[PDB]
Design a protein around this ligand. Sequence first.
Ligand SMILES: [Cu+2]
Ligand SMILES: [Cu+2]
Ligand SMILES: [Cu+2]
Lengths: 355, 355, 355
Amino acid sequence: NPYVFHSDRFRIRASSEAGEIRALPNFGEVSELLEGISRYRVTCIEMKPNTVMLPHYIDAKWILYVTGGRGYIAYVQQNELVKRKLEEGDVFGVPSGHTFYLVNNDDHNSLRIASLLRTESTMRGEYEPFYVAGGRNPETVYSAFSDDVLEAAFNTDVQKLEHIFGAHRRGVIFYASEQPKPFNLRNQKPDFENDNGRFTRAGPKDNPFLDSVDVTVGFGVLNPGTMTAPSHNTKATSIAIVMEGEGRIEMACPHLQDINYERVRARLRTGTVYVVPAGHPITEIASTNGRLEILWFDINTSGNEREFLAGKNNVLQTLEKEVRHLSFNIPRGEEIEEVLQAQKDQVILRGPQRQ
Amino acid sequence: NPYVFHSDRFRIRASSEAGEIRALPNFGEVSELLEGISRYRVTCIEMKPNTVMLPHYIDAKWILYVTGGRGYIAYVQQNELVKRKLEEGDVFGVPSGHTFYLVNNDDHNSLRIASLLRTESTMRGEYEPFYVAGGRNPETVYSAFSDDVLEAAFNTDVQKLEHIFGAHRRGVIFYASEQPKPFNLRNQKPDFENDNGRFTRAGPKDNPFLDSVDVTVGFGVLNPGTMTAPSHNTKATSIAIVMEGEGRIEMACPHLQDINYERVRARLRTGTVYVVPAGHPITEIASTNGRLEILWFDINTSGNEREFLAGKNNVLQTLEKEVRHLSFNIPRGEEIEEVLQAQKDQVILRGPQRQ
Amino acid sequence: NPYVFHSDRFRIRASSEAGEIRALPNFGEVSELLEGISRYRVTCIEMKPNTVMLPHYIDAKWILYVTGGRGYIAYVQQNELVKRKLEEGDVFGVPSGHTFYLVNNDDHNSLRIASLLRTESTMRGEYEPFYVAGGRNPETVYSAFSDDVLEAAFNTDVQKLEHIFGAHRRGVIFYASEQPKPFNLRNQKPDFENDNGRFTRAGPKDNPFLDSVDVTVGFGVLNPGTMTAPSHNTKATSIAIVMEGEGRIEMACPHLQDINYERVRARLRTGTVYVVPAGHPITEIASTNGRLEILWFDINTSGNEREFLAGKNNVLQTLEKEVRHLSFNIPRGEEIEEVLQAQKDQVILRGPQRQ
Ligand SMILES: [Cu+2]
Ligand SMILES: [Cu+2]
Ligand SMILES: [Cu+2]
C-alpha cells in the first residue's frame, strides 16, 4: 500500500536513552503516486522527563503538534531568543534554518511531538540537522572546519576548543518577544460536533505561519463504533496520523479502458500514517474497543472544501431531481429520495457494528 | 513533431452513442521539450441533442470554451447548486474537485466544448474522473466501499443500494447564486481587427477564475489567404486549437556549436493542436479555401507581450538606426529602411498566395 | 566538487575577436545536490572597446551586474526603446523575451558583465538566444522561414532579403522612459563595515525587478588576511562569483547512520563560482597577497537571514546559559563564556595567518 504507513516504517534519526527522533521516508521515494507531496516529511519526537534537546537547525520549515506532555521550545531570531511554553494540543511553527532547542522540565510525563516538515534544501524532500551544540555524539558543524580556521574564528587555541567540542556523548536528547505564540488546537472543539464525534481545525486565517506554508491542521475524535461519512477534499491532500485508539479505513483510488475504482483498505493503530490524495473519497471507521483520535495536515488548503457522498448533507441531494432520476435511471419513482433521507446524521455517522 | 498534435492523437476517455470525451496525452510523456507545461491537459467534449452528462468531479482545475451549441452546466458549491447557461463562445471555469454535470437540451445542435485542464493531483499531468452518479457503465466511487460501510453510510439495506447503483449502463453521456458567470469571448471582437483578420482575448484582469490559473484565452479569425505576422510571446506558452478551416504553420525552434534554428512545419486542419513555447517565433498561414478559426490558451500570461518580426510595428524599426545599420552591415545605405516599410499592415498580413 | 566551479568549467556560447559570452552548465546536470536551483544559469560577458552586441532575446529573466567598464543597454518594450547607461557596479534587469542589445562606446576599457539567468522555457535550466539582427554568423530566426512567407511578411522580393540577412559574419559581438533604471550596488557600501572588510546588498525592497525574481544581490570586499565568520543562510541559496583576488573556502556539508559533516574545501581565484546551499555553514578566507572581491546572488531571499557560528554576535551566546552549559557539558564552569568572548570582531574577522 502506497498510501498507508504503519509505525514500523518510521526510520530512527536519533536514538538515546532519554528520547527518540523518528521520521517517515521521503514520500517521493515510496511511490510515484505521492510525488506531489515529496517536499513534505513526517517526524515524531519523544522526550523523557527532565530532558533537553541539543541546539540545532534544519533546512526545512517546521510545523509541530504536541501530542503529549508539556515543556518549552526556544529558537534564535536576530540575536534574540524566542522562548515559548508548549502544552498538549499546541501547534507552533519554527522558521527554517533557525537554531532551536526543546526542553522537557516535567517530572513524570514525556514530551511527545508530531511534526510536518517542508524542505527548503536544494534536494526536494531531503532535510538534514545541523548541530551547533554537541560533542562526539553527535558531531557539530564545527567539526568540519580546520584547526586554523576555528582557532582564528574563536580567537582561542584549539586545545580549549577540543575540550569544548568533545565533552558531549549523551546524544541529541539527554537528561539534565513579539514573535508568534503557540496556538492550542486540541483545546477549542468548535468546528463540528454531533453524537458520534467532533473535529477542530486551524488554518492560514488563524495563524501567520500556517498561512506561509498553506497548511490547515486538524484534530478529530471518533466515538467507539462510529465512522466518518464517505467524503473527499476538493484540492487539498491530507496527511493523517493516528493519535489514540484503533480502526480501519476504506479509500477509493482510480489509479490502483473502463473507469475502475480500486479499494484501498488498511488497519488503523497508534502511530499509523495515511495519505489521502485530493479527490480520493475515504471513510474512517473506529473500533468498538475505544475512541479514535486523529491529527491531520491539509496540504494546499486554500480554497479547499469537503464534499460528502453520504449523510444528511450529501452532494446527491444538491443535484437537480430530474438529473438524479436520469443518472440512476429508476422505474420506481422517488425510491432514491427515500434512500437519501434514511441517514439522519452528517459528517460523522454510526458505524457498521452499531447501525 | 513534438509541437503539433493532429486530431488522431486524441485518446478516447469515454465513448457512447450520445457523446464522446477525448483527451490529448500528458505533454510531459510526449517530449522533454514540453515538460514545463506537463501540468496542463487538453480535452474535447461532444454532446448530441437532448443529452445529459453523468455528475462527477475531476482532480483538476477546468477552463472550458464552448465551440458549438448551447445548454447549461451545474456544479456543487457548499450545499448549493450553481447553474449557468452555456452558449457558443462562452468561457467558464469549474473549481477542482467540485461535482458537476452538463446538459444539452437543444433539439438539433450538438454541444461541443474545448477545455484546458490544470491538474491538482499528486501526479503531475494526471487527472481522473470520479463518478458519483452511475451504475455499471461507468462504475461510481461507491463501488469501492464494502457493503457494511455503504449500508451504514446510507442507513439502508444493500439490496436497495445495488438496485440504485447498477441501473445505469448508458454511459457517461446519454439521451434524456453569487458564483461566477460564463464570459462570452467569441462575442466581443474589440482587441484587433484589420482587413485580413481579427482576434479577441480574455485574461486575469477580466475574470477571477482565469486570474487564479494565470491563463489568457484567445479567439482569432484569419481571412482566406492571410497570415499572422511572424511573432513570439515574451514569456507565455501557447496551446492553440484549430476550430474551423485549414492552413499551415512555420515555427523556428533552436532546440531541434553554432546557433541554428530548425524549421517546424505542419498542416492545420480542424482539431489540430499545436504548442508554441515561449520565445519561439511562429506564423500561421490560412488556406485560400476558407477562413481559419483558432482558439488558444496562454500559459503564464502575466506580464506577457508579443513582439513582431515583420509588419508595420516590427522590433527592427524600434532599434536605433545605427545599430540596425551595423548589425546587418550594408553598403547600400538605407536599403533596410525601404524594406522595413514595404509592409503596410501589422499583426495580420496578406499571405504568400495573395501578395 | 559539486559546489565549486572554476573558470575552466564555463562553456563558450559565442566567441569572436571583439568579445566573448561564457556560461556555466545547467546546475541540475552537474549534480542532484543542486537540482533545486537548476532553473538558474550563470553567464559572463566581455566586450572590447568600440563594440556592439547583436540585437536578440533569450527565453529567460536576466539580472546583470557590471564588473568592469561602461556603456549602455537598450531593450524593446511595447514599440518603445528603453535605453539605459551602464557603469561599473550597476545592477539591472531585462525582462524575458524582450529584444535587447548592448553597446560599448568606450575607447580603452572593456565592458564586463556577470549575470544570473532565470529560465522561462519549457525545459528547466535551458535557455536559447534568438537573434533578430544578423547574417550567416550567427543565423537569425528569419532563416527558419520559407521564402514565400518571408517575401509575404516583408512585402519585398527574397533577393533584397538575402542581401540583408546574409551580410553579417563578424559574430555576436563586433567592432563598430518610465521603465526601471540601473541601480549601482558597488557604490553605496552602507550595509556592514569593520576593520577587516565590508559588504553591500540590494534586495526586493530596493528594486521592483529583484522583487519579481526574489533575488538579493550582494557585493563584498575582504581585506588581505581576513575571513568571514563561519555562518549560514536560513533559507536562501547563494551563488557567489569571485571578482578579484585569491583565497579559499571551507564549507560543512552533511550530504557528502551517525550524523557526519563533510569538509568542502576549494581554492578561490578570479572567475571561480561556488554554490552555498541553504543551511550550509561556510567561511571565506582571503589570501595575504591581496583583497578578495566577491559578487553573489541570494536565491529565495525573502525572509532569509544569516546566523553566525563564531564572532561577537554568534548564536551560542543567545542560547540560555544553562542549556549552553548542559549541551557542551563542562566541569570547568564558565570556560565556555571565556572562549565565546575571545573574538572581538563580528561577521568579518582576522584570518589564520594574521591572528
Ligand atoms: Cu488514486
Ligand atoms: Cu525550441
Ligand atoms: Cu550538503
